[PDB]
């Protein structure tokens, strides 16, 4: 997250870190046994780290649980990034508490101008690299579809939306992929892609979770 702020420990209790011997992506806990992340975050062996603040120190609110299943959307396309969603089933259920909690799925899509919270452990610089130990947060609005398409001609599908600031300076970044975009207490987005980070006229692009709610529920029920 570029241009964000330190969230505070365990203030985003649905945020997870996906770990393959190092943090590589975020995710969102949607029930005690299931996480939503990006399809491009798939790997064969993932450890989900719940309850994290400082990802480099054992502080005592963590739960480390291996993924048993990581289920990429069958229509995910790695060239266009359409359908960039994955479901992760935990090998055992997380213990839900004030520091480890689920986020609700949406009942409707969000409108332009809705303010959302975006979070992660990704890069905090728009040029070069600086990776945080503690979780970062950004408040950012959803943009109009027309503004989003104008920023990324030919690239925005109906399964994507843009959020952020066209002036630059505030955005998600590498290491934030898969993490949450929460608006009015609902998971509306998944960190997906952008051109650079926090650049002028190049907002973040997020998977539109409201298009997948039925798919998520059916995938969970059958797995």
């Amino acid at each position: 997250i570029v241009g964000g702020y330190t969230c505070g420990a365990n203030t985003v209790p649905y945020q997870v870190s996906l770990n393959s011997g190092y943090h590589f992506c975020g995710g969102s806990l949607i029930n005690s046994q299931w996480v939503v992340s990006a399809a491009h975050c798939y790997k064969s062996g993932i450890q989900v780290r719940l309850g994290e603040d400082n990802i480099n120190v054992v502080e005592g609110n963590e739960q480390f649980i291996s993924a048993s299943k990581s289920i990429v959307h069958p229509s995910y396309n790695s060239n266009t990034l359409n359908n960039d969603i994955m479901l992760i089933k935990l090998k055992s259920a997380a213990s839900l508490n004030s520091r480890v909690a689920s986020i609700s799925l949406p009942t409707s899509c969000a409108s332009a101008g809705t303010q959302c919270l975006i979070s992660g452990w990704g890069n905090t610089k728009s040029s070069g690299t600086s990776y945080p130990d503690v979780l970062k947060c950004l408040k950012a609005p959803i943009l109009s579809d027309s503004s989003c398409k104008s920023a990324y001609p030919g690239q925005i599908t109906s399964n994507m939306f843009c959020a952020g600031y066209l002036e630059g300076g505030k955005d998600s970044c590498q290491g934030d992929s898969g993490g949450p975009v929460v608006c009015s207490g609902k998971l509306q987005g998944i960190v997906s892609w952008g051109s650079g980070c926090a650049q002028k006229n190049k907002p973040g692009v997020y998977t539109k979770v409201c298009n997948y709610v039925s798919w998520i529920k059916q995938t969970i029920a059958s797995n």
Partner: peptide, 13 residues
């Protein structure tokens, strides 16, 4: 170069 995985998407190819 567009996806937001650490360290990058292309790095994993």
């Amino acid at each position: 170069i567009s996806t937001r995985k650490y360290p990058s998407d292309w790095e994993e190819w």
